[PDB]
């Protein structure tokens, strides 16, 4: 469970991301595809080359969903219900992959937000991403 300090930590961090959220989502995906090639099996319909427009577009959507979750951090299951439905009934993403993307998002944040990525904020962000992942796989079965 996210504590009040985690919620503060995540809101602050995410606030600094600001207008770069979309760029960071795309970067995190690029990092994931290169580091963990098996994740590419979920996007056979995408051009996955560096800079391709599909990855840019998908990165924005992921980032916007995260922004939505941060705003509704106290009510995530409801705020993400639609995405939860989508992943459970239309996609077949093995739960392990959420951990891979979560790690790559942290790496992207550490690379871009050095002052804000303190050990306490790192802990909170990891917890937050694990909560989001939990919500997204909650309707699998």
């Amino acid at each position: 469970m996210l504590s009040p300090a985690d919620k503060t930590n995540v809101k602050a961090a995410w606030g600094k991301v600001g207008a770069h959220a979309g760029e960071y989502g795309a970067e995190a995906l690029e990092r994931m595809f290169l580091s963990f090639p098996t994740t590419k099996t979920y996007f056979p319909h995408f051009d996955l080359s560096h800079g391709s427009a599909q990855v840019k577009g998908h990165g924005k959507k992921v980032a916007d969903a995260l922004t939505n979750a941060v705003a509704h951090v106290d009510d995530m299951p409801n705020a993400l219900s639609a995405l939860s439905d989508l992943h459970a009934h239309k996609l077949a993403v093995d739960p392990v992959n959420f951990k891979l993307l979560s790690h790559c998002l942290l790496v992207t944040l550490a690379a871009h937000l050095p002052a804000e990525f303190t050990p306490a904020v790192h802990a909170s962000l990891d917890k937050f991403l694990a909560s989001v992942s939990t919500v997204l796989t909650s309707k699998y079965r």
């Binding site: 098996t38 994740t39 099996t41 979920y42 056979p44 077949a92 993403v93 392990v96």
Partner: peptide, 11 residues
């Protein structure tokens, strides 16, 4: 299984 079926090996 990789190039044609696109099956995540976790399966």
């Amino acid at each position: 299984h990789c190039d044609k079926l696109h099956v995540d090996p976790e399966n």
